[PDB]
């Protein structure tokens, strides 16, 4: 029944007292006497110690030690001694898992046994696959029928100049295996030209959906996935805004169609105006920018890892999240369930 | 002078009227009449056209065409035809969308020198973005060797690279991806302030080395004296951090506003020091990658001059377990012990 202070906890004198911990859990305790007491109790858990054994080394009243212990424990600043038993390649992720009160070995085991479909292997698919690969996802299935170009080299970090002309899935698989040879990687030569094509995509723990062709691709994927009982996550960008979510979970979350948050590009009343709309939109080419692609891909992968690891809530559950690049701004669009929805409702 | 409609533009019927543009510049036009006149005007510029030519081509009054043309132009939805004129031809749409001539931005990047001070997770991600964007010269600074544990974040590294020098492998991986650039190596960790004088002059330093603990304090003081721009990037466990972007004589410095509490009474301060010395960051690739991506965006913008970097006078945090972004003011201070 040992507890141990997590390596990821730091403290600092600040204001009238001090700070405890770093990151989201960072707490500012105003009282100096309380803060110093928290330091004293945490010091007693540097070595794996039971409450009683640590208390025996404390020079503070037991009621105080008890409240600090409770403070430290609820925030996962101290964890079960066993959670620290590991040299392993995934060790740095372990402190992250510990910090959320999870058993590192258990999260890792859930990842090993996971199967993830990368639907679209462009800039998003590249960054997501490599995050998932090097974090220990057991099986990654790459789906794309495109070929590598020279213009790809901006965001598609796995690809090199010599890769031009080769299949995307082929080079990603190669580049993933060189990073994590312990995992299984397959590839499926398919682009979704029609809704029907979706039937060729295998079942998995989740689909990572980032292909943007055709323009209503996410509408197809959603409809299909609702009917197939298949979890998926969308990620991409709308020029300078990084976008990730929703993360659809059958029966637990809203689908893409529920809230009707995005406008349908092509379509008006007047034909004269409608033709022009359709031509302007048909010539659309996104203003790609690695930093935007990278943010979108990174937060998407974090959500997949938490979805499968089960240690913290995915951010994009019931939400489509945007992060700006030309201003300091983050916005989430509501995508919770609608009983009225014609796709997943009634 | 011809004008052309940017390919990054898109529109959609929405609400009372419709939306013009994608991303940051997206504007809901409520008045359907106005929304329609914007598309009619924009339609004339799909293929390059002069103002006057398009005016006759458009089936709308001169007074409306003027306002609509102005709207499109002020938003860089339509740009000078010459701006439409490659490897980096993907980043060109991005620069156009900010009203910059992409060729002249690209030229600035080719003429730039960037120091990557620390080649861990952040240095890996920053360096590859800058390289593939066409930053002309990159100076890689690190003395550590690749460990298997690195592979989780440090995206340029593979299982076969374990044991080799980080600087060495980044360099090879960079040249594989962009052969048009030049990369430099300096085998050096900053364990002593004086090691900074071995760090060359550059357009900007990307600083992400996390040891010693007061590294950013050594960089701050040195860069002020050296009139050297720098940007710090990293993370506080699960929070991604980038900024400040220090610009000599324009911004505050790290020390100015004192936004951070230093890590390091007889009994307690010995215990604090003991705890903090055992500290290891709870690293996580998604967090690493965000800080790095936005760091890189700011360097590109700082050098490219086409848009204001976000981290001027600001230290910015993005949470990963909450939907949250927060910046801390790093405005200039006359009482600062470094640049007051």
């Amino acid at each position: 029944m040992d507890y141990i202070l997590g390596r990821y906890v730091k403290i600092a004198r600040y204001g009238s007292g001090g700070l405890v911990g770093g990151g989201g859990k960072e707490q500012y305790v105003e009282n100096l006497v309380l803060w110093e007491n928290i330091i004293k109790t945490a010091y007693c858990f540097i070595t794996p110690s039971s409450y009683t054994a640590a208390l025996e080394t404390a020079n503070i009243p037991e009621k105080d030690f008890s409240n600090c212990f409770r403070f430290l424990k609820e925030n996962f600043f101290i964890i079960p001694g066993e959670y620290n038993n590991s040299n392993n390649r995934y060790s740095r992720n372990f402190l992250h898992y510990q910090s959320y009160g999870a058993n590192p070995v258990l999260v890792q085991d859930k990842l090993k046994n996971a199967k993830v479909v990368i639907l679209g292997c462009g800039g998003i698919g590249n960054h997501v696959s490599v995050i998932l690969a090097t974090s220990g996802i057991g099986e990654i299935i790459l789906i794309d029928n495109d070929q590598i170009e020279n213009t790809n080299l901006t965001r598609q970090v796995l690809f090199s100049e010599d890769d031009v002309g080769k299949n995307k899935t082929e080079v990603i698989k190669r580049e993933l295996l060189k990073r994590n040879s312990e995992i299984s990687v397959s590839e499926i030569a398919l682009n979704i030209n029609d809704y029907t094509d979706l039937h060729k995509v295998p079942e998995a723990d989740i689909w990572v959906v980032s292909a943007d062709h055709p323009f209503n691709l996410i509408n197809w994927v959603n409809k299909y996935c609702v009917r197939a009982n298949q979890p998926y996550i969308n990620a991409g960008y709308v020029n300078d805004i990084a976008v990730f979510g929703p993360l659809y979970v059958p029966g637990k979350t809203g689908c893409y169609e529920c809230q009707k948050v995005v406008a349908d590009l092509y379509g008006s009343e007047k034909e004269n105006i409608d033709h022009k709309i359709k031509l302007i939109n048909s010539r659309f080419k996104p203003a790609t920018f690695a930093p935007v692609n990278n943010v979108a891909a990174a937060l998407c992968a974090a959500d997949v890892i938490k979805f499968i690891g089960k240690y913290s809530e995915p951010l994009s559950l019931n939400k489509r999240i945007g992060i700006w690049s030309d201003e300091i701004k983050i916005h989430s669009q509501n995508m919770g369930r609608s009983p009225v929805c014609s796709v997943c409702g009634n | 002078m011809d004008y052309i409609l940017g390919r990054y533009v898109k529109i959609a019927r929405y609400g009372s009227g419709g939306l013009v543009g994608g991303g940051g510049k997206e504007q809901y036009v409520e008045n359907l009449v106005l929304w329609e006149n914007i598309i009619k005007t924009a339609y004339c510029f799909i293929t390059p056209s002069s103002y006057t030519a398009a005016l006759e081509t458009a089936n709308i009054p001169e007074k409306d065409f003027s306002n609509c043309f102005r709207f499109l132009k002020e938003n860089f939805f339509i740009i000078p035809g010459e701006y439409n004129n490659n490897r980096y031809s993907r980043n060109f749409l991005h620069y156009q969308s900010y009203g910059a001539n992409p060729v002249l931005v690209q030229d600035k990047l080719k003429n730039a020198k960037v120091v990557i001070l620390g080649c861990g997770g952040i240095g890996n991600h920053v360096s590859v973005i800058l390289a593939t964007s066409g930053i002309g010269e990159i100076i890689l600074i690190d003395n550590d060797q690749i460990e298997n544990t690195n592979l989780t974040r440090q995206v340029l590294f593979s299982e076969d690279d374990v044991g080799k020098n980080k600087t060495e492998v980044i360099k090879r991986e960079l040249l594989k991806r962009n052969s048009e650039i030049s990369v430099s190596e300096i085998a050096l960790n900053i364990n002593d302030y004086t090691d900074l004088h071995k760090v060359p002059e550059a357009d900007i330093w990307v600083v992400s080395a996390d040891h010693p603990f007061n590294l950013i304090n050594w960089v701050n003081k040195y860069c002020v004296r050296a009139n050297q721009p720098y940007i710090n990037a990293g993370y506080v466990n699960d929070i991604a951090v980038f900024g400040p972007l220090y610009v000599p004589g324009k911004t505050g410095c790290y020390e100015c506003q004192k936004v951070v509490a230093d890590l390091y009474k007889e009994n307690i301060d010995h215990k604090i020091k003991l705890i903090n010395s055992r500290f290891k960051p709870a690293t996580f690739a998604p967090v690493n990658n965000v800080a790095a991506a936005l760091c890189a965006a700011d360097v590109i913008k700082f050098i490219g001059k086409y848009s204001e970097p976000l981290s001027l006078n600001k230290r910015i945090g993005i949470w990963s377990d909450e939907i949250k972004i927060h910046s801390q003011n790093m405005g200039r201070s006359p009482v600062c012990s470094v640049c007051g």
Binding site: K10, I11, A12, Y14, L19, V20, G21, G22, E26, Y28 | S208, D210, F213, N214, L215, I216, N217, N232, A233, G234, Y235, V236, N237, I239, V241, V259, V260, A261, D262, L263, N276, F279, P281, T283, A291, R315, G317, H326, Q328
Partner: peptide, 7 residues
Amino acid sequence: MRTGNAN
């Protein structure tokens, strides 16, 4: 964001 410098 306040507990020490960035890592």
